[PDB]
Amino acid sequence: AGSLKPAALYEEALSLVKDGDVACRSLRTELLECYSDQDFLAKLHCVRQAFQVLLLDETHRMFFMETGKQMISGLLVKANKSPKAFLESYEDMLQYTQREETWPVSKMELEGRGVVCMNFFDIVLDFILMDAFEDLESPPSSVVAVLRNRWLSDSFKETALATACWSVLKAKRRLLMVPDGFIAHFYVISEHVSPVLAFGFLGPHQHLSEVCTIFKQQIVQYLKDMFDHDKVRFTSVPSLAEDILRLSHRRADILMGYLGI
Ligand SMILES: CCCCCCCCCCCCCCCC(=O)OC[C@H](COP(=O)(O)OCCN)OC(=O)CCCCCCCCCCCCCCC
């Protein structure tokens, strides 16, 4: 129970957890430093409600959109890369998302990939970000061997890692239930972003490495904080939404500052 004090919303959610009526794609208990799987699920339900409320306000939707745009751009230019491609892919990704008629199909795809809830957390934070990080945490058998090769120039290691990323993304694209849907639109973004992150987390640049490491650190810390009952109030939905919003702005400012925007 640690420092957990009695909270209305939290206990309401915990009821559901004990019934078994709260679902999740991947347990993030240890990563997000929760007390237990039960604790994680309760807080998860609460966070879902919080974002569901938060994203009705169009100002906040704009905040998150703009934030994503700027942070990925900053990462890209700090990787000595041009952000134009990513900017366009991101943009029409959003324009596709805003179309209300796309959403049943999107629901089908995401459910087909294990997403158990149409929520900002489930889609953007868990399915898109934390999965990307968990992916670049464990590169293929082959890639690593190419990386520990003393004889290869690191320009070659660059193009090699790029090729590997494209190969993985290709195998993923082959399994698309829909050619031009949510996950495809996202696979283009991934096409323009994943190589950079990969060569940051695995490459020997050592200044791309620091930037990437700190980027990931900021995101993961943001999520940890979001699941911290002492950082945010799991008492009511309006209060949790207020706290999560402020946390978002804070950590955003921090990351922007680090990237030099
Ligand atoms: C430091 C940390 C800072 C905070 C984190 C910032 C994260 C930035 C996220 C930017 C997108 C916000 C979308 C706002 C609209 C919304 O949220 O839509 C919430 C809806 C549920 O609501 P709805 O269906 O009822 O309709 C809502 C009205 N449209 O589901 C969604 O998610 C759909 C939106 C999906 C957008 C995907 C964008 C992917 C960006 C990937 C970045 C590159 C990563 C590459 C990794 C290889």
Author numbering: 307 to 567
From the reporting publication:
Mitoguardin-2 (MIGA2), a mitochondrial outer membrane protein, forms the ERMCS in higher eukaryotic cells. Mammalian MIGA2 has several distinct domains: a mitochondrial targeting transmembrane domain (TM) at the N-terminus, a coiled-coil domain, the FFAT motif, and a large C-terminal LD targeting domain. Here, we report the crystal structures of the MIGA2 LD targeting domain and the major sperm protein (MSP) domain of VAPB bound to the phosphorylated FFAT motif of MIGA2. MIGA2 (yellow orange) forms a complex with VAPB (gray) via the phosphorylated FFAT motif and then transfers lipids between the membranes by extracting and interiorizing lipids into its large hydrophobic cavity.
A crystal of zMiga2 diffracted X-rays to 2.85 Å resolution, and the structure was solved by single-wavelength anomalous dispersion (SAD) using selenium as an anomalous scatterer. The central six helices of the mug surround a large cavity of approximately 1100 Å3. We modeled this as PE with two 16:0 fatty acyl chains, since PE is the most abundant species in bacteria cells cultured in LB media. The central helices are amphiphilic with the hydrophobic sides facing inward; thus, the cavity is hydrophobic and can accommodate the hydrocarbon chains of a glycerophospholipid. Side chains of helices α3 (F370, M371, and M377), α6 (F426 and L431), α10 (I525 and Y528), and α11 (L561) make hydrophobic interactions with the first hydrocarbon chain. The hydrophobic side chains of helices α4 (Y396 and M399), α6 (I429 and I434), and α9 (F488, F492, I495, V499, and L503) contact the second hydrocarbon chain.
